[PDB]
Amino acid sequence: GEVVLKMKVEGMTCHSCTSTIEGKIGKLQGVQRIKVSLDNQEATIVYQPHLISVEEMKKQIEAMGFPAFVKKIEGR
Ligand SMILES: [Cu+]
């Protein structure tokens, strides 16, 4: 099975930033599911620990401008 990463995000309080990241991340060869929230300012990224990595996720996310605190590995 895949692995869930939970990253707290700041500032992302609209559907645009979140959707944009959802698309961009969705594009990457190795992600399986993604759940970027805004309300509770937190981003779920669900990827396969082989194809892509935390750093790809964050580096690509942070690169947009949105700082993110990737620190939960609650896979199932
Ligand atoms: Cu936004």
UniProtKB/Swiss-Prot annotation:
Tell me how this protein assembles.
Answer: Monomer. Interacts with PDZD11. Interacts with ATOX1 and COMMD1. Interacts with TYRP1. Directly interacts with SOD3; this interaction is copper-dependent and is required for SOD3 activity.
Residue numbers binding Cu(+) 2 = C14, C17
Q: Tell me where in or outside the cell this protein is found.
A: Golgi apparatus, trans-Golgi network membrane; Cell membrane; Melanosome membrane; Early endosome membrane
Extract the signal peptide range. none
The family assignment reads:
Belongs to the cation transport ATPase (P-type) (TC 3.A.3) family. Type IB subfamily.
Q: Which disease is it linked to?
A: Menkes disease: An X-linked recessive disorder of copper metabolism characterized by generalized copper deficiency. MNKD results in progressive neurodegeneration and connective-tissue disturbances: focal cerebral and cerebellar degeneration, early growth retardation, peculiar hair, hypopigmentation, cutis laxa, vascular complications and death in early childhood. The clinical features result from the dysfunction of several copper-dependent enzymes. A mild form of the disease has been described, in which cerebellar ataxia and moderate developmental delay predominate. Occipital horn syndrome: An X-linked recessive disorder of copper metabolism. Common features are unusual facial appearance, skeletal abnormalities, chronic diarrhea and genitourinary defects. The skeletal abnormalities include occipital horns, short, broad clavicles, deformed radii, ulnae and humeri, narrowing of the rib cage, undercalcified long bones with thin cortical walls and coxa valga.
Positions of the HMA domain: 3-69
Q: What is this protein called?
A: Copper-transporting ATPase 1
**Source superkingdom:** Eukaryota
Q: What is known of its domains?
A: The nucleotide-binding domain consists of a twisted six-stranded antiparallel beta-sheet flanked by two pairs of alpha-helices, forming a hydrophobic pocket that interacts with the adenine ring of ATP. The heavy-metal-associated domain (HMA) coordinates a Cu(+) ion via the cysteine residues within the CXXC motif. The transfer of Cu(+) ion from ATOX1 to ATP7A involves the formation of a three-coordinate Cu(+)-bridged heterodimer where the metal is shared between the two metal binding sites of ATOX1 and ATP7A. The Cu(+) ion appears to switch between two coordination modes, forming two links with one protein and one with the other. Cisplatin, a chemotherapeutic drug, can bind the CXXC motif and hinder the release of Cu(+) ion.
Q: Which gene produces this protein?
A: ATP7A
Function, as annotated, reads: ATP-driven copper (Cu(+)) ion pump that plays an important role in intracellular copper ion homeostasis. Within a catalytic cycle, acquires Cu(+) ion from donor protein on the cytoplasmic side of the membrane and delivers it to acceptor protein on the lumenal side. The transfer of Cu(+) ion across the membrane is coupled to ATP hydrolysis and is associated with a transient phosphorylation that shifts the pump conformation from inward-facing to outward-facing state.
